[PDB]
Amino acid sequence: NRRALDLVAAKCYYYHARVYEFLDKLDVVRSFLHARLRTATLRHDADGQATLLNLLLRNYLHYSLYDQAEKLVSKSVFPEQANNNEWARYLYYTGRIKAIQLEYSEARRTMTNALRKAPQHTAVGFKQTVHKLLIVVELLLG
Amino acid sequence: GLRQYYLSKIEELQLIVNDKSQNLRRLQAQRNE
Amino acid sequence: GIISLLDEDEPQLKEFALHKLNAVVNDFWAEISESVDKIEVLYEDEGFRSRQFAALVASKVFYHLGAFEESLNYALGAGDLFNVNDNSEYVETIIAKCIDHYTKQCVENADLPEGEKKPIDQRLEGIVNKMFQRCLDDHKYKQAIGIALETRRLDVFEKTILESNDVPGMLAYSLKLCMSLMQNKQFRNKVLRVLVKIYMNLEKPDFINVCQCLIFLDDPQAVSDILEKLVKEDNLLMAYQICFDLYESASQQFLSSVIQNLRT
Amino acid sequence: MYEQLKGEWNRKSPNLSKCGEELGRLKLVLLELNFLPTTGTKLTKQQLILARDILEIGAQWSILRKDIPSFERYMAQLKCYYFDYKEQLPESAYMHQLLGLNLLFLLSQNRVAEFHTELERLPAKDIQTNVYIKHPVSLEQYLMEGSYNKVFLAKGNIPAESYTFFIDILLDTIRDEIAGCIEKAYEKILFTEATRILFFNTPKKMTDYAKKRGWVLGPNNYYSFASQQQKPEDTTIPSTELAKQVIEYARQLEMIV
Amino acid sequence: MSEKKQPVDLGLLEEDNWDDDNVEDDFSNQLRAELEKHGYKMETS
Amino acid sequence: DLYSRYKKLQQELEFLEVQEEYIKDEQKNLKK
Amino acid sequence: GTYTLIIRLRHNVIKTGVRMISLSYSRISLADIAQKLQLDSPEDAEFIVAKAIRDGVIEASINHEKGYVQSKEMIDIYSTREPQLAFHQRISFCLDI
Numbered sequence: 001n002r003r004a005l006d007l008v009a010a011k012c013y014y015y016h017a018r019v020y021e022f023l024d025k026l027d028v029v030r031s032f033l034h035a036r037l038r039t040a041t042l043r044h045d046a047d048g049q050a051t052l053l054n055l056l057l058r059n060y061l062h063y064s065l066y067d068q069a070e071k072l073v074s075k076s077v078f079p080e081q082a083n084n085n086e087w088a089r090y091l092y093y094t095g096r097i098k099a100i101q102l103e104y105s106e107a108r109r110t111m112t113n114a115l116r117k118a119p120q121h122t123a124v125g126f127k128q129t130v131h132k133l134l135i136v137v138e139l140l141l142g
Numbered sequence: 143g144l145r146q147y148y149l150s151k152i153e154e155l156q157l158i159v160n161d162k163s164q165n166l167r168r169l170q171a172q173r174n175e
Numbered sequence: 176g177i178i179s180l181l182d183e184d185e186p187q188l189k190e191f192a193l194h195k196l197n198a199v200v201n202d203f204w205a206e207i208s209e210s211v212d213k214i215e216v217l218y219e220d221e222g223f224r225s226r227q228f229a230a231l232v233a234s235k236v237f238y239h240l241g242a243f244e245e246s247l248n249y250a251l252g253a254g255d256l257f258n259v260n261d262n263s264e265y266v267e268t269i270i271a272k273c274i275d276h277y278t279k280q281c282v283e284n285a286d287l288p289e290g291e292k293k294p295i296d297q298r299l300e301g302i303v304n305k306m307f308q309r310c311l312d313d314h315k316y317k318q319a320i321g322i323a324l325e326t327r328r329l330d331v332f333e334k335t336i337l338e339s340n341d342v343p344g345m346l347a348y349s350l351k352l353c354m355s356l357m358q359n360k361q362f363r364n365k366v367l368r369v370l371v372k373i374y375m376n377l378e379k380p381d382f383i384n385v386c387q388c389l390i391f392l393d394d395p396q397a398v399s400d401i402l403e404k405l406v407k408e409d410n411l412l413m414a415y416q417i418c419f420d421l422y423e424s425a426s427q428q429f430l431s432s433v434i435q436n437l438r439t
Numbered sequence: 440m441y442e443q444l445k446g447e448w449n450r451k452s453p454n455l456s457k458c459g460e461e462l463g464r465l466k467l468v469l470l471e472l473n474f475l476p477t478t479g480t481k482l483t484k485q486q487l488i489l490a491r492d493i494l495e496i497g498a499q500w501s502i503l504r505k506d507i508p509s510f511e512r513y514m515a516q517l518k519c520y521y522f523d524y525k526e527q528l529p530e531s532a533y534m535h536q537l538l539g540l541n542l543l544f545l546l547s548q549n550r551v552a553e554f555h556t557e558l559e560r561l562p563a564k565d566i567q568t569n570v571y572i573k574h575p576v577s578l579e580q581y582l583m584e585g586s587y588n589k590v591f592l593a594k595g596n597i598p599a600e601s602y603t604f605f606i607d608i609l610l611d612t613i614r615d616e617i618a619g620c621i622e623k624a625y626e627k628i629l630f631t632e633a634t635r636i637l638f639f640n641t642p643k644k645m646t647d648y649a650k651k652r653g654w655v656l657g658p659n660n661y662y663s664f665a666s667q668q669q670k671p672e673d674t675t676i677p678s679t680e681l682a683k684q685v686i687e688y689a690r691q692l693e694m695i696v
Numbered sequence: 697m698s699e700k701k702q703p704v705d706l707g708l709l710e711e712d713n714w715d716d717d718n719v720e721d722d723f724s725n726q727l728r729a730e731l732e733k734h735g736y737k738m739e740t741s
Numbered sequence: 742d743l744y745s746r747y748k749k750l751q752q753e754l755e756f757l758e759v760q761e762e763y764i765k766d767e768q769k770n771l772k773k
Numbered sequence: 774g775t776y777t778l779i780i781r782l783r784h785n786v787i788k789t790g791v792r793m794i795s796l797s798y799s800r801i802s803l804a805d806i807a808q809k810l811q812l813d814s815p816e817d818a819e820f821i822v823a824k825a826i827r828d829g830v831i832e833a834s835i836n837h838e839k840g841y842v843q844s845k846e847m848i849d850i851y852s853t854r855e856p857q858l859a860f861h862q863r864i865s866f867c868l869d870i
Contacts, residue, residue: 018703034202038239042268044154064560070205075241085699100778102555121700128707136778139785143315144306144322147271148743155750162757169764173771177475179512191469199477321744356748558777565780584784585820624823625835632837677854684861691868 002046010051017055026059041076049076050086057093068097088117092130099133104141111137176203178210181217186224189217193225197232204239211236218252231256238265243272251298260306270306277303278325285327285362307331316340320349327362329369336373346373350384354391364392375401382417390425395433402437440471444493457500468493476524487527491520495533502540502604514541522560535564536599539571546579547605549612554579570598587613591638614639618652626663633661787821788830795831795844802841 095111230253237246323332357363371388374381405414498513833844
């Protein structure tokens with residue numbers, strides 16, 4: 001029964017991650033997220049294939065392991081419903097993943113699209129980082 | 143029983159139906175005008 | 176990854192590796208999908224001991240990958256390891272797609288079962304009828320009475336009309352569904368024929384709708400026979416009623432034919 | 440449950456094929472407990488601290504006897520333990536030396552994605568110190584462009600060990616690459632100059648290298664292979680794909696989309 | 697409406713109508729005045 | 742009932758998409 | 774967290790320098806390329822220029838016996854097929870929008 005619970009729970013298990021982020025372990029958060037992902041994406045299409053992916057990737061990189069196998073084969077690449085807010089950070093993450101592996105041609109376009117998807121609000125927290133990378137990688141490419 | 147299987151199937155069909163309905167509702171207007 | 180030591184020949188070391196992999200696959204399905212073909216090599220070696228175990232982990236991998244046809248292939252290959260049916264979403268979704276593949280193939284063979292079919296895996300029809308029996312014991316007979324149509328299999332239907340339910344209710348329900356929704360004569364006539372004789376078998380001979388069924392499929396001789404039996408009951412009342420119900424809906428040609436059977 | 444590894448043949452003469460027993464040792468250590476901990480029986484280090492040894496000495500013997508797949512296996516397991524559990528001792532002593540060796544091997548087999556990918560997971564030791572690790576990245580940086588004299592100078596400078604096993608392969612894959620590149624740099628070379636720019640001396644090796652390629656000689660002369668003009672002055676393939684392209688323009692221009 | 701929030705690392709501790717050209721800042725590395733270079737170069741020769 | 746929840750859904754799926762065809766042809770004839 | 778990306782920028786710098794040198798002059802001895810780009814050695818500049826020629830960075834030839842590098846002259850890019858590709862690449866975009 002998730003004709004509302006799903007899009008209500010998204011925010012819930014988005015703050016849930018922040019709770020552990022500010023404190024203790026994250027590995028078992030990864031285990032839980034991995035389970036929860038196939039707990040979804042099997043009830044036909046239910047969304048969350050956007051938020052859970054970003055939650056999984058947020059600190060998968062922070063632990064400094066650049067696994068990419070599942071990202072090229074991920075079936076949740078295309079939730080298509082992101083409210084134009086999830087899509088930006090998802091594209092940023094996949095762009096940095098692609099750029100760290102000596103691939104510069106596609107990272108520029110994808111992450112420029114990600115940056116220019118950013119909203120108009122005064123806060124510039126993540127825009128600082130995306131700009132910084134978006135110009136390092138352009139110096140690298142030719 | 144086997145209710146879960148049936149639920150899954152019926153849910154999938156109903157989820158699909160709405161998109162089609164929508165994409166046809168717009169089409170009717172143009173013809174009418 | 177530990178899959179490295181899958182390159183060793185020793186079966187004991189394989190039975191260490193696989194029994195880690197099947198316990199951890201949930202979190203590394205993509206990284207193991209990089210090499211699952213090697214597990215198919217272990218499945219191919221009929222000389223290999225514990226051969227059946229590789230099929231389960233391979234099925235888990237391909238399930239995680241969405242290669243559900245391959246998942247079903249190796250689920251069948253792992254066979255009796257699917258004696259568990261009662262918990263994991265893995266088995267639930269696999270048996271659901273098993274139902275789907277089986278019914279679609281049976282509908283294909285509803286043209287002709289002798290139509291040079293791909294030989295049926297006994298494991299497939301095994302687990303499908305096992306889940307059907309599960310549905311029977313759960314008392315959820317309203318599922319079975321429906322699914323009996325989509326297997327296109329008549330004997331299980333002829334049986335399971337007798338169950339914990341009262342026969343006439345489910346029987347009339349099913350006959351109504353058939354007359355309303357069944358898409359083609361090829362199956363509908365078989366279903367009607369195989370069922371309606373129950374009304375001559377049931378402790379009350381319920382001729383009233385037997386006339387109906389014998390005019391939806393024309394058989395003047397049969398209805399003339401049951402009419403003659405009612406006549407030889409020396410009771411006219413039902414033998415009157417059945418025939419006046421006949422007259423309101425039978426074809427003029429049908430009556431002009433059955434007159435021959437009745438007169439001689 | 441015994442310290443069989445305490446009877447480790449080493450000293451100055453470990454020549455004996457330890458593998459015959461080593462295999463039984465690895466089999467028994469696996470048959471014991473916690474070959475890969477996952478999460479269990481924490482604070483027990485005898486099965487753990489020993490395993491690191493029962494893998495480091497294995498990998499060193501592996502490099503000595505040229506068993507590339509076995510070395511890859513040992514690398515994998517040791518790279519697992521080195522990182523996964525941080526409740527253990529500092530390990531150390533050989534961690535950096537081995538990591539540098541692994542990076543060197545990645546460079547040797549001409550994979551440049553993995554070398555960059557695995558440069559990560561090191562906090563700051565790339566420039567902090569770790570000469571065992573400054574050498575591989577410096578060699579990679581020199582190799583990325585034409586700077587090759589420094590490469591050969593450094594091939595005689597390894598603070599770790601001989602490393603002839605990989606720097607050899609490197610020498611071969613530099614010889615063939617330079618032979619390929621000189622084919623178009625310039626029109627003519629002198630035979631002495633050609634023999635000296637390539638680092639080999641004057642053996643029959645130069646003659647054989649020329650034989651392996653073309654490099655037809657002249658009177659102290661090397662002819663340039665010259666063509667570079669086949670591609671130009673062509674329109675028919677353009678005259679077809681331009682037609683395809685213009686048809687594609689007109690396709691989605693008037694029909695309702 | 698106007699949710700406009702991002703989680704982490706807000707930082708930094710808190711005109712010209714002529715289109716920008718890179719070259720302007722290149723010689724901002726030095727050569728403050730053509731004057732100074734010419735004046736203090738010509739005297740030598 | 743639970744079987745009709747499948748049959749009726751199949752029937753609406755069948756009936757829809759034939760609605761598409763006449764409108765698709767009609768817009769063509771109209772400008773003509 | 775960006776030291777690793779920018780630590781590999783030396784090759785881009787040397788490519789830019791050699792391309793600028795190629796575009797500026799037409800015939801220059803390598804006894805001055807090293808001094809201008811401060812490589813502290815002239816001999817390896819030959820290898821650097823050779824690698825540059827390999828990748829199509831510049832089409833200049835080199836007389837090794839002499840030492841000077843001479844470059845070809847390629848003008849009139851308007852007749853080349855590339856501007857048509859450049860126009861097509863954005864015709865597609867303007868039709869899509």
